[PDB]
């Protein structure tokens, strides 16, 4: 066994959250919101003189991709779902259409908010992010998401080409079997690191989709095949070291004319439509802090290879992964 592998696998077992297909609670919470939308849409379309448009829901996000983590105490579950409205995008304003969904959910939980890229509804200990799409078959064969806020300019409210099922396929398909299992474990490790070390400043935290897209570009398996048994062992500490170092290598000093200084920026393009940099909203100063903390994590991963005393190696890692990283007693 690779150094600290037992402790990484135990850490994974503590942080992992069962995916939608294995998680009745999440399916029930998802479905309760989809039912509230269907009921709520009846009221909204009561004064329009026609039936509410129908929609086709689909699972999105980490709970669809088997990369979900449990929140830390006081954190929330992030239930991501897509709804494809039986509407032509050319007939409707994208913020108009998100208002249907917001109004439908007005009285559900702690209420609902139009965000740039979804309508979010709040419950105790979880939120549900509904991504709202027009029907491809009515919208020129394209799947487009409703972008813009109520307080957005005409240029910022748009139906944007989006490929959530292609992204989910690219994550599922990069690797297979226990190689793909290591890939998903390493995405989860970085999400717990994110939640433990980016808790001061929420909006500074690297988005889950960005960490996932970074792993899609740059993750490499680390494993060994025993020359006698051909038994395979994985080295999650090494896989994370190489991945973290590769991320650090892709930061680029980027001049900002407004501030008259450079900030180190990591660009991570989605590998499907709309091919945007998913880290674009992070400020330069937040990027600088992200790089510094990633470098500190790299240095701890290297320390965990050298310590020899298992307690010391694991303590170095728990300083970046938090209190659920197992630290054996010396």
Ligand X SMILES: Nc1ccn([C@@H]2O[C@H](COP(=O)(O)OP(=O)(O)OP(=O)(O)O)[C@@H](O)[C@H]2O)c(=O)n1
Binding site for Mn ion (CB under 5 A): 61-62, 78, 80, 129
To ligand X, the closest distance from the beta carbon of 129 in angstroms equals 6
Q: Which is nearer to ligand X, 21 or 107 (CB)?
A: 21
Number of residues that bind ligand X (CB under 6 A): 20
To Mn ion, the closest distance from the beta carbon of 122 in angstroms equals 12
Of 8-16, 42-50, 157-165, 319-327: span binding ligand X (CB under 6 A)? 157-165
Among 55, 126, 159, 167, binds ligand X (CB under 6 A): 167
**C-alpha gyration radius of the chain:** 22
Of residues 39 through 98, those in contact with ligand X by CB under 6 A are 60-62, 67-68, 78, 80
Under rule CB under 6 A, residue 131 binds ligand X: yes
Q: Give Cα separations from 48 to 44, 51, 98, 284, 319 (angstroms).
A: 8, 8, 16, 46, 57
Under rule CB under 6 A, residue 139 binds ligand X: no
Binding residue per annotation — 273?
Answer: yes
Under rule CB under 6 A, residue 207 binds ligand X: yes
Binding residue per annotation — 186?
Answer: no
Cα end-to-end span (Å), the chain:
20
Among 12, 191, 237, 265, binds ligand X (CB under 6 A): 191
Binding residue per annotation — 173?
Answer: no
Instruction: Give 3-state DSSP helix, strand, coil % of the chain, rounded to 5.
Output: 45, 20, 35
CA angle 152, 268, 117 (to 5 degrees): 25
Binding residue per annotation — 27?
Answer: no
Binding residue per annotation — 191?
Answer: yes
**4: closest CA among 226, 297, 301?**
301
Of 34-42, 173-181, 206-214, 303-311: span binding ligand X (CB under 6 A)? 206-214
Query: How many angstroms separate the CA atoms of 300 and 317, rounded?
Result: 6
Q: Which of ligand X, Mn ion, none does residue 242 bind (CB under 5 to 8 Å by kind)?
A: none
Q: Give Cα separations from 154 to 39, 87, 94 (angstroms).
A: 30, 20, 10
CA dihedral 90, 96, 98, 104 (to 10 degrees): -120
Tell me the H-state helices in 83-230: 94-104, 164-173, 177-197, 208-218
CA angle 250, 254, 259 (to 5 degrees): 150
Q: Which residues bind ligand X (CB under 6 A)?
A: 60-62, 67-68, 78, 80, 129, 131, 162-164, 167, 191, 207-209, 212, 270, 272
Question: Binding site residues for CTP, as ranges?
Answer: 62, 80, 116-118, 129, 163, 191, 194, 209, 273
Annotated binding site for GTP: 62, 116-118, 133, 191, 194, 276
């Amino acid at each position: 066994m690779a150094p600290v592998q037992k402790q990484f696998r135990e850490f994974h077992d503590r942080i992992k959250l069962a995916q939608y297909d294995e998680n009745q609670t999440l399916r029930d919470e998802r479905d309760a919101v989809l039912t509230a939308v269907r009921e709520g849409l009846k009221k909204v379309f009561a004064d329009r003189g026609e039936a509410a448009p129908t929609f086709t829901p689909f699972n999105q996000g980490s709970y669809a991709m088997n990369t979900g983590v449990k929140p830390l105490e006081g954190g929330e579950y992030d239930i991501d779902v897509g709804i494809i409205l039986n509407i032509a995008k050319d007939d409707h304003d994208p913020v108009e259409v998100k208002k249907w969904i917001r109004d439908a959910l007005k009285d559900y939980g702690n209420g609902a908010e139009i965000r740039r890229s979804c309508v979010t509804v709040f419950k105790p200990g979880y939120h549900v992010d509904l991504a709202v799409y027009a029907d491809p078959e009515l919208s020129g064969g394209t799947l487009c998401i409703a972008k813009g806020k109520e307080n957005s300019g005409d240029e910022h409210r748009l139906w944007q080409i989006s490929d959530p099922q292609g992204f989910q396929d690219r994550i599922a398909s990069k690797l297979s079997g226990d190689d793909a299992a290591q890939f998903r474990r390493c995405i989860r490790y970085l999400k717990r690191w994110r939640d433990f070390r980016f808790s001061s400043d929420g909006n500074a935290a690297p988005l889950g989709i960005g960490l996932t897209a970074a792993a899609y570009w740059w993750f490499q398996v680390s494993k060994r095949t025993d020359p006698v048994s051909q038994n395979v062992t994985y080295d999650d500490r090494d896989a994370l070291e190489q991945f973290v170092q590769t991320m650090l290598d892709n930061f680029h000093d980027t001049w900002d004319s407004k501030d008259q200084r450079s900030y180190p920026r990591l660009t991570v393009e989605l590998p499907v439509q709309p091919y945007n940099d998913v880290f674009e909203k992070m400020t330069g100063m937040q990027m600088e802090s992200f790089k510094s903390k990633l470098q500190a994590l790299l240095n701890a991963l290297k320390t965990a290879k050298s310590r020899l005393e298992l307690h010391d190696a694991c303590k170095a890692l728990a300083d970046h992964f938090g209190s659920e990283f197992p630290v054996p007693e010396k």
